[PDB]
Symmetry: D2
Subunit: 326 residues, 4 copies
Amino acid sequence: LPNITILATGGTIAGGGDSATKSNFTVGKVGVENLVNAVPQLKDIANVKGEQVVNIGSQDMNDNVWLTLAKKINTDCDKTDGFVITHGTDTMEETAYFLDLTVKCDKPVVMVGAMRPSTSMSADGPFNLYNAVVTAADKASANRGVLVVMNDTVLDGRDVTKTNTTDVATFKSVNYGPLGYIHNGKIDYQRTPARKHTSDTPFDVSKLNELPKVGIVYNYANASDLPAKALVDAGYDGIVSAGVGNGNLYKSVFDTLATAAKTGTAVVRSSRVPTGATTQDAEVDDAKYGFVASGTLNPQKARVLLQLALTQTKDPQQIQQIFNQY
Amino acid sequence: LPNITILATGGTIAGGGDSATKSNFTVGKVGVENLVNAVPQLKDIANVKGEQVVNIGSQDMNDNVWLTLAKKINTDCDKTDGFVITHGTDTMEETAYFLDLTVKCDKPVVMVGAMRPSTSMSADGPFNLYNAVVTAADKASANRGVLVVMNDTVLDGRDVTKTNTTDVATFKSVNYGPLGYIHNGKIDYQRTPARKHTSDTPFDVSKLNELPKVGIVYNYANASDLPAKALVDAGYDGIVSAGVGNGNLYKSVFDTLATAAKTGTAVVRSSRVPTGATTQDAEVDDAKYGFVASGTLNPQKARVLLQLALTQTKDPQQIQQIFNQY
Amino acid sequence: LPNITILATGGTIAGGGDSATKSNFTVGKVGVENLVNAVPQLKDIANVKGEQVVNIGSQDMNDNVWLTLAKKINTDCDKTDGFVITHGTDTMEETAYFLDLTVKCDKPVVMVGAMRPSTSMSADGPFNLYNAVVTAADKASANRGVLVVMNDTVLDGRDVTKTNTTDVATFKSVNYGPLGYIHNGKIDYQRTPARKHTSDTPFDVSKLNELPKVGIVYNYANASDLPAKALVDAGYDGIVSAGVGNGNLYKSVFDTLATAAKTGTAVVRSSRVPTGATTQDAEVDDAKYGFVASGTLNPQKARVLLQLALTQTKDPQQIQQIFNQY
Amino acid sequence: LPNITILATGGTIAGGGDSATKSNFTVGKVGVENLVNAVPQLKDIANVKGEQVVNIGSQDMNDNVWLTLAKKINTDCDKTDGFVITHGTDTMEETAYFLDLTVKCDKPVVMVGAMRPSTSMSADGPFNLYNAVVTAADKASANRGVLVVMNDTVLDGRDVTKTNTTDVATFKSVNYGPLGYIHNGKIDYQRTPARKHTSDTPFDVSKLNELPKVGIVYNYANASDLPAKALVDAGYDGIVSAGVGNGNLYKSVFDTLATAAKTGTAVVRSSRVPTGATTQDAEVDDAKYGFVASGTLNPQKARVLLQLALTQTKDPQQIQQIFNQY
Ligand SMILES: N[C@@H](CC(=O)O)C(=O)O
Ligand SMILES: N[C@@H](CC(=O)O)C(=O)O
Ligand SMILES: N[C@@H](CC(=O)O)C(=O)O
Ligand SMILES: N[C@@H](CC(=O)O)C(=O)O
């Protein structure tokens, strides 16, 4: 059987409350094999090895945990057959993409969480975990970049996003679709991401101990520019604008970002719209202002790419070429 | 024939570029009957009357235009049979909800825009406009609150949102669905919003010349609290948190908002997740901190309701009862 | 506590296999009590009464079980506070609509199934059943027609349909959306079906012992007319055509049905297309041929309505008025 | 400029009515040139060559047109740079997949239709055609199998399907998603179909003049077996069952097909359910009965594959291996 290493980071997947009727869910609530003893069926498809990296609610996820997982994975690659990462569902789409860009291991790396606390009836965690490990042990899962396995579906780290606040079927690659579907331990792959990932990226955080400073400003009617200004005065390396429609910005916010763009601040235009790309040929002329169009990357994902892009350049033209290849 | 008044506000619906191959679209590009002469078929279903209120790109939409439309509509109610409002698509979901809460006229009020410039081939504006006026002239459209008509569909002002950056089929009530579908001028209504609207709301901006100050902060991994702090120090009346998952906040942002909540700042928790409600029984205990759960209202909509709620109260418990009824 | 009556008819909701890894699922596998003892939390929200009407796999569902459930519910109405009906998921959409047209009880009537056998991990049956009982005990569920509760959602029997073959979140009302969402025992209703149902229908099967004969023919490229012909020669009261696109038919099938239309056979045009209405103003001129357009009803629901319409008429013009009101 | 060959077969893309208010749409209404002169911008992106293969409404599409298009494309391959095929939207999904299996040309082969007659306002034909030609002229479109371009989207012929009866954004690849999105003449490809197609299939209709006989029976509550029986007695090579749920059949239909399976009739199990795969490990045991599971292929696509599979075998075990690779 394959040697599957499980890197735990916390999340609902490893926590409940007190009863099925009601529960006091917070961030976590249990160690590692607890999340191995509960699903005794795993022992049938793999040799699982656990290790608690940290144990928080993804809502508090941050650069350090990211950098750690990245290094941890790069280091253990040769010693194991595939990795499974338990994680909260709130920022799972953010961590998955980061790892997708930094992991240099091409053996399966599957992320998995749970939308219901283990204490609830019909909790999805146990089946999600099973399937995740099944995917990880599957030879065919290799070379597809970081994956996310939820509700019998295999989703790529780039397009995946949480589309619903409570639904167990929340996760979907809203622009390009899933890569495969799972049935009784069997996976039918019919897709694989085109953009370069993992071992094929220039990014390598092996020696980094911290990442650039990137913030996200939001756009709406009568929007205030203070948040934008705040991040500027506070000296931030880059800023992702969650624009309205196709990457548009409210006057105020536009000016502030237009100026900061001069000062030498990396500005990427993304959109609050859940689906579709922020194209370069629209209302705004990024060429003149130095803005970068995020494409199909949403605000929180465009950030991930801006940080890494900044670890290697500050030229809007370069950063933009990056946003067109990863 | 019914007397349909058209209140123009600009938007792509009234603008193009230069050619079909390429165009220099900005915010607007044409007056009022231009948007009446182009679709000569209107004269067959109604007596259209135009009036340019303003002419901007919804990306710059703001409180004043809102307050104006509100007053304009309340005033003209008795003189016309229904209203049609041309508007940009970028913040259409924001203006529609505001009017839904303030218009005291129960005669049809339909909003409509266009995802393609009139200069492009297969431009959707002309058909959207037609259908909008058809809906407005339809007796059955009355008493359903403010509507939005795009791609042969009739959507309510509350649930409607832009789900795609370029698709002509972008607008969808993502939580509860459309109210009716249009076919050859005929509408099949099978739904009507349950929450109280228009004439049944306590809100009345007749005498207001400005609205409270509400800003939106965004949540992601390693989120910064500066934007939140900025809006606080700048003395804002309320703040809507675009949280992760079910209304959760990143540590930093949570503290800042938790404190400001004491100071007397109205804090509502919404989510960046495009679908689903931000419930009151989750991780965070709003009772202790004074936060209000937005429900199915997204960030930019929860703002609209916070502003109006503030024009009448600052008690979290009251504001919350409002978020459960409108 | 409410007195909720549970009428069981079988389905996966009441059956598994042998183990979590593998199971030998067929049609059923357990009585009534079992589906009450498994969820001991029910006792806290209601006074449940069981009764096994039948116990098959919905794939074998038929007119008799329908007539029975209808009669059973009508008779029991005054004795209980609400009904829950465990059912298979394959034809649940068909049964749900039938009851929606024939039940003359306006107290809560909720249908519920499960996509995963009770033997699997993360089975969805126990939570569905819970929620279905919460729904049936809720005063606000009355007068909304027959409901279907699956995956924390309350769907009407007319629009609901199975959109996926294996997904637990398979049931959706694809044209008009859900009526409400369930959350920690609480239901947020924001919709209600406009079409007349239950107590407001002319249909009453009290004295019927059998229903008319309606068959469904399918349309594709190079389609054969033999199935259509067979149902004709076999003397069928009506025929629903699962056409391509907007109710279109392949030449062959068209002639056969066009002819049988004269003979006195009730012909309804529906579509194989999952979403949208089959309209009257399209390619085909139903007026000349005597065809009836199904509207948003899919083939299997267009049948339910044709059968009941036939128990009261055979005039295309009247049958069509029926398809426009129910 | 690329030499793009346009093979026309009719459909709405080439027909209207009389006016914008009303039209008498039937099947077609115009030659080839017209669908080139209407869009004078084509001349700037390609050297278009036309040819009218046939001119019907896809509802009447059939094996002959298929065999012809296949042969026509194979023969012309070396003479041109890419093909565009104007087609009706009703059975476009069926034709698209057939070509996907039989075309041995790997240069761009794009299909395209229109949901609105050229006479209506905002007709979608002209922009679809434009984009289809852009797609066919794009070097990156090669080797992706037969494509379908609608509403600014590039869909593969295997997964594509008509999800709505009237919506211009009706075509979607419901299981695996689009391959790319078109934007201002530019295409962002991020996917490509994994299943073998065109030049990598064993199927070659070069010498065939007709295809096997496959029919589709439908499943619902109280279903009749007569249509199944009819296709049997009529001596049909194969039968696709549009089952309920995960390929399940109603008792009656089951026996009939179970028996015909022995007789030597190719029986494939598909589902009426719009999304998801019909799996082999479910209720029914295909191994014992000789049935073949369709996978994600819907009924009308399961037919296309069964016909071609039959041109090379009749062994259930082999036919099944075919459904698992194409
Ligand atoms: N608060 C939890 C939510 C979940 O995982 O379901 C988390 O983000 O880890
Ligand atoms: N920039 C335009 C976009 C559109 O209407 O299509 C607006 O928001 O008005
Ligand atoms: N074949 C079973 C499966 C299920 O219940 O989900 C039925 O339809 O009853
Ligand atoms: N009935 C026509 C309609 C269309 O083309 O869209 C066809 O399928 O060809």
